[PDB]
Amino acid sequence: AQYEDGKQYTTLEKPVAGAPQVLEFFSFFCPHCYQFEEVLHISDNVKKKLPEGVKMTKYHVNFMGGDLGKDLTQAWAVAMALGVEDKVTVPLFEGVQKTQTIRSASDIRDVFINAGIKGEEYDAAWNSFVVKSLVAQQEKAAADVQLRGVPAMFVNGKYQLNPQGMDTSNMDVFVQQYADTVKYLSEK
């Protein structure tokens, strides 16, 4: 077959019911995640090829970067609640991995302030029980699929993208293959 279990994707022997249609996991500490976002724009190219009536979800994980990793998961919850994901994703990636100017929760906060979210607004969100449940959701979704590595994408709670089995000579061909795989799995 052109798409084979175990080649462009793997199948969860323990399928997750009620799961989001397209579910991505990342960490701001994760080097391939940095590429996926800034160089490859995976999420965006997947969205462009998906049918529609299909929603895309992206969650942060705790297992990298210890205490700061958990802060970043809460901050991503703040980003989701306020709907400012597209304004903070790149400066969070560069603050953690490029400039190394993110070393504390106050530094994460600065990224939001500089992106124009108001102090008042960020701190209220940060402390809100809407953000608490949102952090819980990120953890539960990761827990549901035994997640030990990122970047990771899961379709319909039963298939997991496997980028290691796609060509990487050409960044653009890699992305189309990844996106076309998501679409194929979507239609499956």
Side-chain angles (χ1 to χ4, degrees):
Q2 287 285 348
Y3 296 93
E4 283 156 17
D5 188 298
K7 176 67 179 155
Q8 296 98 322
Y9 68 102
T10 50
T11 302
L12 302 178
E13 40 186 275
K14 252 263 200 305
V16 163
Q21 292 177 279
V22 180
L23 177 62
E24 260 177 297
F25 293 97
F26 78 110
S27 171
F28 284 109
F29 278 95
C30 157
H32 284 146
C33 304
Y34 186 112
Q35 288 321 157
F36 268 42
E37 165 68 26
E38 289 201 11
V39 185
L40 305 177
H41 307 287
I42 291 292
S43 296
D44 190 76
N45 279 281
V46 167
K47 172 175 185 116
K48 289 193 301 80
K49 289 212 164 157
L50 289 176
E52 105 163 340
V54 55
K55 80 174 319 299
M56 284 181 74
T57 307
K58 171 134 71 195
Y59 291 159
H60 194 267
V61 295
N62 293 340
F63 63 80
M64 298 180 80
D67 217 283
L68 254 198
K70 281 206 80 159
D71 278 326
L72 280 166
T73 299
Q74 187 161 355
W76 187 245
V78 174
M80 282 183 298
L82 298 177
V84 291
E85 300 96 323
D86 296 348
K87 291 159 190 205
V88 296
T89 285
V90 164
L92 286 168
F93 267 118
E94 295 183 1
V96 179
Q97 294 183 53
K98 188 181 176 184
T99 59
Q100 292 210 314
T101 47
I102 290 177
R103 317 209 215 79
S104 67
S106 175
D107 299 338
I108 299 172
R109 184 169 182 279
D110 285 348
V111 169
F112 286 67
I113 303 307
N114 183 52
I117 293 86
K118 290 301 228 185
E120 208 177 33
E121 194 186 346
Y122 179 93
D123 302 339
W126 181 268
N127 288 295
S128 73
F129 287 89
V130 172
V131 153
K132 296 207 188 313
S133 60
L134 225 33
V135 163
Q137 285 166 231
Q138 294 182 92
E139 302 185 6
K140 178 177 183 298
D144 281 349
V145 292
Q146 332 332 306
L147 186 71
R148 100 173 72 83
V150 282
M153 188 181 289
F154 296 86
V155 188
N156 279 151
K158 343 182 208 217
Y159 313 106
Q160 182 182 352
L161 272 290
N162 172 48
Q164 280 126 323
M166 306 174 184
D167 196 356
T168 65
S169 55
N170 184 307
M171 319 190 86
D172 302 305
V173 170
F174 171 74
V175 175
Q176 286 343 302
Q177 192 179 354
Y178 195 101
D180 289 341
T181 302
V182 178
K183 180 175 197 289
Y184 158 79
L185 292 176
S186 185
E187 290 155 3
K188 209 175 177 77

